[PDB]
Each structure stands twice: as structure tokens, then as C-alpha cells.
Enzyme design. Structure first.
Site, PDB file in Angstrom:
ATOM      1  N   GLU A  11      45.491  45.629  40.122  1.00 16.82           N
ATOM      2  CA  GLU A  11      44.536  46.555  39.453  1.00 16.82           C
ATOM      3  C   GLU A  11      45.158  47.636  38.622  1.00 16.82           C
ATOM      4  O   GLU A  11      44.464  48.276  37.840  1.00 16.82           O
ATOM      5  CB  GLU A  11      43.726  47.302  40.526  1.00 16.82           C
ATOM      6  CG  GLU A  11      43.077  46.165  41.264  1.00 16.82           C
ATOM      7  CD  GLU A  11      41.833  45.628  40.601  1.00 16.82           C
ATOM      8  OE1 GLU A  11      41.084  44.866  41.150  1.00 16.82           O
ATOM      9  OE2 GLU A  11      41.523  46.112  39.410  1.00 16.82           O
ATOM     10  N   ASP A  20      36.802  48.489  32.544  1.00 16.06           N
ATOM     11  CA  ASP A  20      37.538  47.355  33.069  1.00 16.06           C
ATOM     12  C   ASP A  20      37.478  46.111  32.168  1.00 16.06           C
ATOM     13  O   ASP A  20      36.951  46.127  31.042  1.00 16.06           O
ATOM     14  CB  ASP A  20      37.135  47.045  34.483  1.00 16.06           C
ATOM     15  CG  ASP A  20      35.800  46.362  34.579  1.00 16.06           C
ATOM     16  OD1 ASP A  20      35.417  45.984  35.644  1.00 16.06           O
ATOM     17  OD2 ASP A  20      35.086  46.240  33.477  1.00 16.06           O
ATOM     18  N   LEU A  32      35.425  50.626  40.954  1.00 19.52           N
ATOM     19  CA  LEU A  32      34.304  50.584  40.045  1.00 19.52           C
ATOM     20  C   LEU A  32      33.322  51.751  40.164  1.00 19.52           C
ATOM     21  O   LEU A  32      32.842  52.149  41.231  1.00 19.52           O
ATOM     22  CB  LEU A  32      33.513  49.289  40.041  1.00 19.52           C
ATOM     23  CG  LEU A  32      32.278  49.559  39.175  1.00 19.52           C
ATOM     24  CD1 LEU A  32      32.573  49.482  37.669  1.00 19.52           C
ATOM     25  CD2 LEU A  32      31.116  48.707  39.628  1.00 19.52           C
ATOM     26  N   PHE A 104      37.645  42.139  46.970  1.00 19.98           N
ATOM     27  CA  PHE A 104      37.715  43.461  46.371  1.00 19.98           C
ATOM     28  C   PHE A 104      37.321  43.374  44.915  1.00 19.98           C
ATOM     29  O   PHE A 104      36.619  44.194  44.346  1.00 19.98           O
ATOM     30  CB  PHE A 104      39.207  43.831  46.405  1.00 19.98           C
ATOM     31  CG  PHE A 104      39.493  45.213  45.911  1.00 19.98           C
ATOM     32  CD1 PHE A 104      39.664  45.486  44.549  1.00 19.98           C
ATOM     33  CD2 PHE A 104      39.646  46.255  46.831  1.00 19.98           C
ATOM     34  CE1 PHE A 104      39.955  46.788  44.128  1.00 19.98           C
ATOM     35  CE2 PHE A 104      39.953  47.557  46.422  1.00 19.98           C
ATOM     36  CZ  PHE A 104      40.121  47.818  45.061  1.00 19.98           C
ATOM     37  N   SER A 117      35.021  25.793  47.773  1.00 21.87           N
ATOM     38  CA  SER A 117      36.435  26.217  48.011  1.00 21.87           C
ATOM     39  C   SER A 117      36.593  26.752  49.398  1.00 21.87           C
ATOM     40  O   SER A 117      37.591  26.557  50.068  1.00 21.87           O
ATOM     41  CB  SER A 117      36.756  27.433  47.122  1.00 21.87           C
ATOM     42  OG  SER A 117      36.866  26.941  45.792  1.00 21.87           O
ATOM     43  N   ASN A 132      39.883  23.485  42.989  1.00 24.98           N
ATOM     44  CA  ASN A 132      38.495  23.869  42.910  1.00 24.98           C
ATOM     45  C   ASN A 132      38.397  25.314  42.552  1.00 24.98           C
ATOM     46  O   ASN A 132      37.577  25.800  41.764  1.00 24.98           O
ATOM     47  CB  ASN A 132      37.815  23.671  44.285  1.00 24.98           C
ATOM     48  CG  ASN A 132      36.323  23.918  44.260  1.00 24.98           C
ATOM     49  OD1 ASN A 132      35.897  24.954  44.711  1.00 24.98           O
ATOM     50  ND2 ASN A 132      35.509  23.087  43.535  1.00 24.98           N
TER      51      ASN A 132
END
EC number: 3.2.1.17
Length: 162
Positions: A11, A20, A32, A104, A117, A132
Site C-alpha cells: 500500500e 487510490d 480508505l 484488507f 478459488s 483461477n
């Protein structure tokens, strides 16, 4: 390597409000603020989050604090999610970080949609799950990060992070 380090790498860290990759207002270490177009809304949410009038800027400690809260919240989110918990419980330490990372970044709900998945992960089908996993908007939109995460799930090592 650990989850904080990993995420810190994915990040980045910024002490000023920024947009972002999806164009939304964020600060710190991927925290966020709002999906709204309004910078004011963002400033507001930021001050409410920090507890002071920041005027779009924060300190490193402040950033790290939010970061701790955020990682804690994702773990917990996972642990409470009926679809997610079992997965997480079946994984080794490394792979657990990969899952937290996704959560996250995208939310419990978003993650929870990777039904196929997840199942593969549960069953230890590494390469299958990797393939996948790559078939996704996620992968197509932030390929470098996705690749890192994928590899991690794939190998159970930190190689993608050096």
C-alpha cells in the site's frame, strides 16, 4: 516478513490525502476514507477518524495507528465470516497473510465471492487456485500486487516480496 510488512509494501504510506487506484480518497497505509468524489467529505471523514482537525494531513504515528486498527479489523472480519473462516483455518501462516491481504484490499464481501478459488485453497490445490484467482477484475486492474499475492498463495513462501 509479516502481514504489516507485506501490506506496507503493497500500500505504500502517504501522509496526505490521496486518490487510490480506483480514484477514491485514501490516506496513510491504504486507509480508505470514502468512496465519495468530495474532497470535503474526505476531510471530514479523516478528522472523524483521527479525532482532530487534520486538514488532510496526518502524522506517521497517526497513520500507523489506523493501520493497526485496519489489520485488526480484517483479521476479525475473516474470523467472523462463515465463508472465510474455514479457509483461513485450513491455511499455513504464510498463506494466511495472503488472505488477509486480499481482505484488507477488498473487503470481506468481495473476497467471499471468490467461491471457486476459496474452495481450491481449502483443498490445497495451489496452482489451480492461482490460475483461477488470476481470472478476475482484481488481477486485471492491479496486476502487480495481485501477482504478488497470488504467488504467495501459490508457494507458501515470501519470495514475491523478497
Amino acid at each position: 516478513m509479516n502481514i504489516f510488512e507485506m501490506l506496507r509494501i503493497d500500500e505504500g504510506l502517504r501522509l496526505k490525502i490521496y486518490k487510490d487506484t480506483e480514484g477514491y480518497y485514501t490516506i496513510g497505509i491504504g486507509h480508505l476514507l470514502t468512496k465519495s468524489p468530495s474532497l470535503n467529505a474526505a476531510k471530514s471523514e479523516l478528522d472523524k477518524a483521527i479525532g482532530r482537525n487534520c486538514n488532510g494531513v496526518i502524522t506517521k504515528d497517526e497513520a500507523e495507528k489506523l493501520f493497526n486498527q485496519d489489520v485488526d479489523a480484517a483479521v476479525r472480519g475473516i474470523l467472523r465470516n462463515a465463508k472465510l473462516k474455514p479457509v483461513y483455518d485450513s491455511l499455513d501462516a504464510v498463506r494466511r497473510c495472503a488472505l488477509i491481504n486480499m481482505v484488507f484490499q477488498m473487503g470481506e464481501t468481495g473476497v467471499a465471492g471468490f467461491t471457486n478459488s476459496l474452495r481450491m485453497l481449502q483443498q490445497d490445490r495451489w496452482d489451480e487456485a492461482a490460475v483461477n484467482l488470476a481470472k478476475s477484475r482484481w488481477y486485471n486492474q492491479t496486476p502487480n500486487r495481485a501477482k504478488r499475492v497470488i504467488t504467495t498463495f501459490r508457494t507458501g513462501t515470501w519470495d514475491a516480496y523478497k
